[model samples]
Target: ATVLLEVPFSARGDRIPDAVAELRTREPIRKVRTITGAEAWLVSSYALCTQVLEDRRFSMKETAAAGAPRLNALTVPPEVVNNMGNIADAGLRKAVMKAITPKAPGLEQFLRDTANSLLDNLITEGAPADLRNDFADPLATALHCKVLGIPQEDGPKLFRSLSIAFMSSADPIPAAKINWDRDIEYMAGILENPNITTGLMGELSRLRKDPAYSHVSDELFATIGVTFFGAGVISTGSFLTTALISLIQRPQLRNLLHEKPELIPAGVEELLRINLSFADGLPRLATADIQVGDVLVRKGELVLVLLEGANFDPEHFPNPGSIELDRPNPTSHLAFGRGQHFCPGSALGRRHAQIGIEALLKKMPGVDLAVPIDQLVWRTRFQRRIPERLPVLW
Candidate 1:
């Protein structure tokens, strides 16, 4: 066995870390010690990552089990999910999935309208400034709140608190942490109310009281509401930001996409393949012994299938680093994850990004980086690979 490397390799510039490429060639399924001081198998090969994700033996619920390896202090205990149900609250998850499903009534149009209006505000703001703060942040947060019945006025405050909650920072601002608590308390109150609306929290509120969903609890509903806000807002906003950056950087492709409009979907896929929001892999635990990429992963061991690295695997993707809008099977990228636990927000994310790109291209035709690319700041708390701000100008 090769010696375990201390984990959380940083990426320099706009590419995956050179160390990751070296490790993929040398030890595709190697053991590593996490920042949290836990041990795990980090799988880098495309085929192996997919195989590991598809196998039911690798359980997400195991993270709650004793002795599981953790990447950081920020992990949401599976118990928050488990306590809701024996596992995840099936009713709650189903309700969320149904709401976000591609063909779910009112979602597609809602996405388009929201994207356009947000861009209108950005145009009004007089740019040459952070696109994330004025555009990406509010756009994604408003869409998430709109889907969860949270008042639009509450979006900015809720988003800030959810940010601190997900990062679980060691030296967090006192007000942000307090806001997180306040939001959860607010979620608990929303769950307790009997009035129903056409959103995830409303559906959950009804489910929590139904005799049919006996497993559901007020805390579970509140937790799901909180989870939806955190996961939906941060990841989606980060993704839209990345997509916009990639799109605007290539002026020719951006112009083509703007002209054709019909190609927006294909462009969205290519952008997702080249630049995904989640930097590291999704962590899973083995329920049984498994072999991945010439290495044996023993039962009860932690394994993280590096999805972003897998998307860059050359064996499957020729010229994987470059964005090819018409690349065959561009949808195959694991950006939204894969297998049974594939992200429930995949459809919503794609549609939101597609509309965001289309609206920006139409509304802000001359968008460009206002500063040198290297001058842009990054958010390091969760190790998500994205610029903290995409300062742009028309």
Candidate 2:
């Protein structure tokens, strides 16, 4: 009897499981069992991963359709599966896109100030600081709150919801719903508050009453706030934390970036390419029969596009493990994904990591892992692959 491989491979963010490379070489598109005990086709090569993402027939929203095989239980309401589509339908996409841009007036400065402040506090407190909790997560929370026009103090309360909000599990998560309802209510209140007149929510609040958008549902307004905050914080925080680890592990790279800050952008792009922040493969449901590699995926089938598989494929990226700042095809990695559903916050996410890294290297040029690399505990069954606590010393 042939045994099926269980996905996620390993929770350790610092290392990619050897199995990923073996599978990519042997069977790039093969079946695997997800957390929910549902079998799905796992696409594990650069070519096939790109094919699935580029094809609209491979539907992301349909993955939430009732009775469709699940990659994992829905963390948010089913409708939120097609979040970008709903935003477009409501005519809020352009506004949202504009609000999230890193070029937004004062946004980059806010990020720099926040990063520096966090580093200063850590420096004062001495060594063995938990970078994940103290620095990376807080900076992420601060950036989202500023972008969303919400109170900076309220960020921690909203931030608390994420641990439960981003879980990947086999069964329904009751706490997730409880937090979701509470968060939605909070966002709804923000939409109504007169003082909330800046950032994305301020714009959304004005549009909510506009006659042109009067038909838009109240649920969508609130969902936008909750989803954007949760997604942004989780993604940016987890990514910067892991990228720091990657840099600290390589003293030569860290020294080089510190010596010449101009190369930080290229370094950041390479970091985005290699960073294993996404815990599970990106899932899509087929709306029509499609042939991917040797597999003829039928309609209603679940297909997972493994990001690392594509990013690390030796065929596409020579010396896949090394972070080559001068790679000709540097930004081609699927870190921000591709096709219609590509991440809108990609610009903001990149800027956040770039600033955080630049600030850290300046403030703490000797930064390194405080404990053994293996001593770091990795969060499991969560949306992003990150250390539970990134204890570091400079």
Q: What are the Cα lDDT values of the candidates? A: 0.75, 0.95
Evaluate residue 371 in candidate 2 and report its C-alpha lDDT on the 0 to 100 scale.
99
TM-score of each: 0.90, 0.99
Prediction RMSDs, each to the true structure: 2.9, 0.8
How far is 155's C-alpha from truth in model 1 (Å)? 1.4
Give me candidate 2's TM-score against the actual structure.
0.99
Q: Write the per-residue lDDT of candidate 1 for residues 28-131, one digit (tens) a residue.
A: 89988876667999998788889988897898777567656666554454465243343253555566777655465776687778778877777787877577
Query: Which one wins on TM-score?
Result: 2
Give lDDT: candidate 1, residue 372: 79
Q: What is the per-residue lDDT of model 2 for residues 7-61, given as tens digits with 9 covering 90 to 100? A: 8788889988888999999999999999899999999899999999999999999
Candidate that scores best on lDDT? 2
lDDT of 2 at 80: 97
